[PDB]
Write a protein that binds this ligand. Structure first.
Ligand code: MG
Ligand code: MG
Ligand code: MG
Ligand code: MG
Ligand code: MG
Ligand code: MG
Ligand code: MG
Ligand code: MG
Ligand code: MG
Ligand code: MG
Ligand code: MG
Ligand code: MG
Ligand code: MG
Ligand code: MG
Ligand code: MG
Ligand code: MG
Ligand code: MG
Ligand code: MG
Ligand code: MG
Ligand code: MG
Ligand code: MG
Ligand code: MG
Ligand code: MG
Ligand code: MG
Ligand code: MG
Lengths: 152, 119, 62
RNA sequence: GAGUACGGUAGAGGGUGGUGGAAUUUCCUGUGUAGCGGUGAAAUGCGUAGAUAUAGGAAGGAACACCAGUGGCGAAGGCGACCACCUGGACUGAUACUGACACUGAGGUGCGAAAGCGUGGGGAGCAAACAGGAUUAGAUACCCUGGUAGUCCACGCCGUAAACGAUGUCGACUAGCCGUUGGGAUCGAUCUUAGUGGCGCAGCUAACGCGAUAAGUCGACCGCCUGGGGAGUACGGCCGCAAGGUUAAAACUCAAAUGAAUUGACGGGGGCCCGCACAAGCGGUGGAGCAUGUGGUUUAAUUCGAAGCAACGCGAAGA
């Protein structure tokens, strides 16, 4: 917006865990206002993570997002006759949004019985990085060096 | 298969509007190796950026390190971008800078330049 | 267009010294002026425009 | 008024020879390798037959950065490396001298950018024509890679340009302010001259604007104009080797053509600002089945109307 007066609302309504990132992930996985459905699906996924993963699931969650967040992002700018791309450092707030969106959209595309164990599967895969979300993250990362020439 | 040693050579930059060419020779002006932004995989629009100039300069310096060359006298010629990129990039290979010179040929009156471009 | 190195200062002060020397030499202007032939009519036109701009600046100084 | 004699300044004023440095190109040689060049992106082209970069050498041609300036000189066109020789004019100071010897000028006489023409030379860069590669619906162009005449010199011709200050030459008067070139005089200041610029009062002008470098107030002489096209064309004459130049009509046709300024609109002109306009996101249409409207076809009728956004689940909130 040209005016830049649009402030942001603050949401923090963690039911039991009392965290922050969890609720934003809730909103990301919430579809068509099905908040309770998102509750039960993500909590079943986290239960599977907790039974599979020895440690608590929240630090595993944040470590998984640590391996999906892209450090730099490429963005096309047209020089006026040619279609270029420019690498830029990602906004610190934007990193979490990209992390959450990528993780959800990649957990959606597994194809197994439900997306609770899909979310668990990519949560453990992203915990060190053998998933597909990390594949897209590293591809986008390497595009920056592929286009480091312009940068400025 | 022969090998020869040399110390305190000269590195040369040809920085035109489309390209930059970095070469290494001895004090007698005999080439040892050379690097060009074209051969590094840049091909035109990317060929002009100072980053490619830095890459070519550091590649040439690394190739020069085999013969030693503890000292380097550097000439730069041409108005292209990267006129200063190579100067900084050469130290990345660990070279002693002894003299930086600009040898751009300035015609006094000379021949006449080509016709103006109508764009 | 040429500067010496001496007394182990960091390799940035000498860089700015070289940049300043090059821009005092005006090498870029002259090398740009030789890219294409400028017919004399355009040369006198440019000089007249520069003259009128300079005189307008000097008059507007008061 | 005009001119002569005598000292001193400034200047790319003209002509003839000689000499400089830089840079380009070509050729030869040395190490060294796989790319160079070019573009909006490419390609043509050049490449281990060793390029570009780089080092050394050789030949040849042309233009004279920095000084450089609203700067200077010349009747105009025009004239920038340095040196010598030949030469024209202007500016400045005092005295003497000639004593109207002046101004303009139809005819005529010359000088006159660039391109072009003839004979003989030369030829590096550039570059009409031309060849190829792109772009494009086409591209006999713009762009890229090459490239001949020409651009350079000597002699001769050609007589043209937005050859412009779009303002003929000569002379005398009319408020002022700020620069500047190159000379004097007075005590950095002042005064005065010949140029060269920017504002501006009266005055002039259709307006723009000019305004001591008038487009103001007046004199002397000359050149030119009489609606737009046809047409600066035809015919004749005179010039030119040719290209062509100069002088210069008519029939016919139209009711306009034109200058300056004003309001708006527009622009692949400029500057600020706004809007789910982009950007950042979420969910869709376009694919399938069905509902509903419209176009078209058929029919006896498919009853009328609505037609870019601003018609098409619209008049119709019920065939
Ligand atoms: Mg070119
Ligand atoms: Mg060579
Ligand atoms: Mg007369
Ligand atoms: Mg006459
Ligand atoms: Mg005459
Ligand atoms: Mg000529
Ligand atoms: Mg000839
Ligand atoms: Mg000839
Ligand atoms: Mg061409
Ligand atoms: Mg001919
Ligand atoms: Mg005429
Ligand atoms: Mg003229
Ligand atoms: Mg006239
Ligand atoms: Mg007068
Ligand atoms: Mg005025
Ligand atoms: Mg009048
Ligand atoms: Mg008539
Ligand atoms: Mg005629
Ligand atoms: Mg005739
Ligand atoms: Mg407008
Ligand atoms: Mg959008
Ligand atoms: Mg459909
Ligand atoms: Mg359909
Ligand atoms: Mg109907
Ligand atoms: Mg509706």
């Amino acid at each position: 917006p040209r005016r830049r007066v649009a402030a942001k609302r603050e949401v923090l309504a963690d039911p039991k865990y009392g965290s922050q990132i969890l609720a934003k992930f809730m909103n990301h996985v919430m579809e068509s206002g099905k908040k309770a459905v998102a509750e039960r699906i993500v909590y079943g996924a986290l239960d599977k993570v907790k039974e599979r993963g020895k440690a608590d699931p929240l630090e595993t969650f944040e470590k998984a997002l640590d391996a999906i967040a892209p450090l730099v992002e490429v963005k096309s700018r047209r020089v006026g006759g040619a279609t270029y791309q420019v690498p830029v450092e990602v906004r610190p707030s934007r990193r979490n949004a990209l992390a959450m969106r990528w993780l959800v959209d990649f957990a959606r595309k597994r194809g197994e019985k439900s997306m609770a164990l899909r979310l668990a599967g990519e949560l453990l895969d992203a915990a060190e990085g053998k998933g597909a979300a990390v594949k897209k993250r590293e591809d986008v990362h390497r595009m920056a060096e592929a286009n480091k020439a312009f940068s400025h | 298969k022969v090998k020869k040693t040399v110390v305190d050579g000269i590195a040369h930059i040809h920085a035109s509007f489309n390209n930059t060419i970095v070469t290494i020779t001895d004090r007698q002006g005999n080439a040892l190796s050379w690097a060009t932004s074209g051969g590094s995989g840049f091909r035109g629009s990317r060929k002009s950026t100072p980053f490619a100039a830095q890459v070519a300069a550091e590649r040439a310096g690394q190739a020069a390190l085999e013969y030693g060359l503890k000292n380097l006298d550097v000439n730069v010629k041409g108005p292209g971008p990267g006129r200063e990129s190579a100067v900084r990039a050469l130290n990345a290979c660990g070279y002693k800078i002894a003299s930086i010179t600009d040898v751009t040929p300035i015609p006094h009156n000379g021949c006449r330049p080509p016709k103006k471009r109508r764009v | 267009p040429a500067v010496k190195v001496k007394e182990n200062e960091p390799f940035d002060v000498a860089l700015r010294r070289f940049k300043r020397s090059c821009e005092k030499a005006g090498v870029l202007a002259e090398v740009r002026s030789r890219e294409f032939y400028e017919k004399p009519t355009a040369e006198r036109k440019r000089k007249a425009a520069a003259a009128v701009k300079r005189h307008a600046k000097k008059v507007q100084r008061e």
